[PDB]
Design a protein around this ligand. Structure first.
Ligand SMILES: Nc1ncnc2c1ncn2[C@@H]1O[C@H](COP(=O)(O)OP(=O)(O)NP(=O)(O)O)[C@@H](O)[C@H]1O
Ligand SMILES: Nc1ncnc2c1ncn2[C@@H]1O[C@H](COP(=O)(O)OP(=O)(O)NP(=O)(O)O)[C@@H](O)[C@H]1O
Ligand SMILES: N#Cc1ccc(N2CCN(C(=O)Cc3ccc(C4CC4)cc3)CC2)nn1
Ligand SMILES: N#Cc1ccc(N2CCN(C(=O)Cc3ccc(C4CC4)cc3)CC2)nn1
Ligand SMILES: [Mg+2]
Ligand SMILES: [Mg+2]
Lengths: 352, 352
């Protein structure tokens, strides 16, 4: 059987695939044709069908896993297209996590003799995150932060060492947000969550702007000015609110200037997209800050695909977490941020 | 001079007016005609102009204040109409709080010889809240909670005693949200705030539904089904997420079902209004919960005008705070919830 791990989320399916590269002459002979066809299909294409994508830049090359050498591949497609995936499969042991491992369990069992092993979506996350950081990103750091995030002329991506990763607050921004406190490799809990996550960004953006994709929403947001929609502290006070150290630029009311009909009539789609992004990103940062203070954890790592190709939100989180915590908290990011559940599921294979 | 206190917020101006009722025969003679005209104007009308309203049901009758007996009146109008108010005044000591006491300071000084005394918006809140609870609501409790908030056949408003009110978490839901921790009558701090408040509800509702007022937004929300817009835990898992005690009905992603074009095309305005209300209310509850746990405070009182004529949000807060805290936190409400800053400002009059 090929070695897969799958994370079926509310929005995206993430698949980690281990491609062996130490196949001997004898092993090749015993390779059944359906299996050779899968390996060739996966390694010679970067787009699969109309909606599947291999993230080639994330490939881990010449990894030793389960006593074999191979390449670790990272693939994603929309959960809405899981029926296509399962139909391809009907034309072997699957370790699966995410809510969809439960929701679609009966559908995976339509593949004859398939053994589905459901693994918990946050257990897999912790195991996958720790594993990828430990093996490194082809010799480079898996984890990074934004140095001098408050000064745009200085702000830059820099590596961060996690060789002793505990304790760690993990903020998983998917459709919603789960917040985990990780005290050791076997001692972690889900602190809380928030419903204002990546699905809120995408869903509200689509309602407000008519954008047709995540990438289009980000494109619009990059051109917009959120202060056309948001009411700032300076809109209420005329300046800073000095008594409580609130700068005039801080958002007092997200979308709060949209209570005025004339402002609704002048605001652009791009402004609304940027206000949606800023509202969601600041709320995630603030909740993370409150949880870090309560858990007595000062390293906060953000994962999940809300942040893929989303440097705006990453830089906003880096700045906001640093600013509003007075430098006590540090925002961390991971190169493989959307795939840790899929990797953790793959790592469960030896238990079956 | 008449005895006023004013709280000029980002959205509403709140005015507390003390009407003396122990005017002697001699005092009446010395009553200057402009002053008699103000008192008659205020006490014989319940609507002022097109946008001012006296909340007659909140009047405190036969209150002793500053050694005189009188009635305490509660009046509100939109901050957008403050120019009309100031123009009426130009056709005496004003204790004023809220951001507008700073933003509009120069405008109040266009009233000749007027003395404007700016007081801090959260200091006034604490003083006004403690004062009104102490004098009672015409012999009835100022503070109330929802008994058995989880069972709709039982859920009912019941009085709550605050004779020893400390400590107290005060959640002020105006345009945005300020969270205060009150340890004594002179020891209180602003813990944090969130930008997702009443202005977010009203602004997003107006963008999404075309509603023209707060009351219309609430009317639409009362008819809607937020689960048409929100992605629930059961939409992702097919049921409860048992491992972490998440019920299937919990919202996993606010507006998360609006990433699907066909769902955007079937959702009603009423559904969107209700989803906006639920999203904002749950976020306020969750932030309050996290702050209460960090501050080691188990009584959480919600104030501000987001909750005026808004039993939906009050009941949602009562249920959610109780459910998600496993009964450790209690949601409290106050009959005069939008006016405490205005009262606290009035109480500053003897210092000038
Ligand atoms: N191609 C894409 N399509 C859709 N959403 C995308 C895409 N790229 C990034 N996103 C964002 O990524 C989020 C989904 O992140 P992801 O971590 O994959 O969540 P999920 O696992 O599917 N959901 P959950 O069940 O809550 O864990 C979306 O809500 C978007 O904000
Ligand atoms: N008649 C109304 N007009 C507008 N908003 C209303 C009205 N009635 C209730 N609201 C709600 O009440 C909120 C304003 O509450 P309020 O406590 O008066 O805030 P504010 O003091 O003006 N703002 P802030 O400067 O942030 O303290 C609005 O955002 C609405 O959600
Ligand atoms: N990472 C991270 C992170 C990101 C944001 C964040 N904020 C906490 C602080 N804040 C507020 O208080 C908002 C607010 C200001 C004024 C008022 C009213 C007095 C007029 C109400 C509400 C903004 C959000 N905290 N942490
Ligand atoms: N008062 C008050 C109050 C109100 C709400 C509240 N919630 C905290 C708990 N919660 C979540 O975790 C949301 C969520 C669920 C699942 C997932 C993903 C696994 C698929 C992500 C996110 C809902 C909001 N807490 N307190
Ligand atoms: Mg996920
Ligand atoms: Mg206010």
């Amino acid at each position: 059987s090929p070695w897969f791990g799958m994370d079926i989320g509310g929005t995206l399916v993430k698949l980690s695939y281990f491609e062996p590269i130490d196949i001997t002459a004898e092993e090749e002979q015993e390779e059944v044709e359906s299996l050779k066809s899968i390996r060739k299909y996966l390694t010679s294409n970067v787009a699969y069908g109309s909606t599947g994508i291999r993230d080639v830049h994330l490939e881990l090359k010449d990894l030793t896993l389960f006593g074999r050498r191979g390449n670790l591949h990272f693939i994603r497609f929309p959960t809405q297209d899981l029926p296509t995936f399962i139909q391809m499969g009907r034309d072997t042991v699957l370790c699966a996590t995410g809510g969809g491992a439960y929701k679609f369990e009966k559908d995976f069992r339509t593949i004859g003799n398939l053994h589905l092993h459901k693994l918990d979506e946050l257990d897999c996350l912790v195991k996958g995150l720790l594993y990828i950081d430990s093996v490194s990103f082809n010799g480079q750091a898996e984890c990074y932060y934004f140095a001098n995030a408050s000064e745009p002329e200085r702000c830059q991506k820099m590596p961060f060492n996690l060789d002793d990763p505990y304790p760690l607050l993990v903020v998983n921004i998917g459709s919603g947000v789960s917040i985990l406190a990780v005290h050791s490799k076997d001692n972690y809990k889900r602190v809380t969550g928030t419903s204002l996550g990546g699905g809120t960004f995408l869903g509200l953006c689509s309602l407000l702007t008519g954008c047709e994709s995540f990438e289009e929403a980000l494109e619009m947001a990059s051109k917009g000015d959120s202060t056309q929609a948001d009411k700032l502290v300076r809109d209420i006070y005329g300046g800073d609110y000095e008594r409580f150290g609130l700068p005039g630029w801080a958002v007092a009311s997200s979308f709060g200037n949209m209570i005025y009909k004339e402002k609704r009539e002048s605001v652009s789609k791009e402004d609304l997209a940027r206000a949606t992004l800023v509202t969601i990103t600041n709320n995630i940062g603030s909740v993370a800050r409150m949880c870090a203070v309560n858990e007595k954890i000062n390293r906060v790592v953000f994962v999940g695909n809300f942040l893929r190709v989303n440097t705006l939100s990453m830089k906003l989180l880096a700045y906001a977490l640093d600013y509003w915590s007075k430098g006590q908290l540090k925002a961390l990011f991971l190169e493989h941020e959307g795939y840790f559940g899929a990797v953790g599921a793959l790592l469960g294979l030896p238990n079956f």
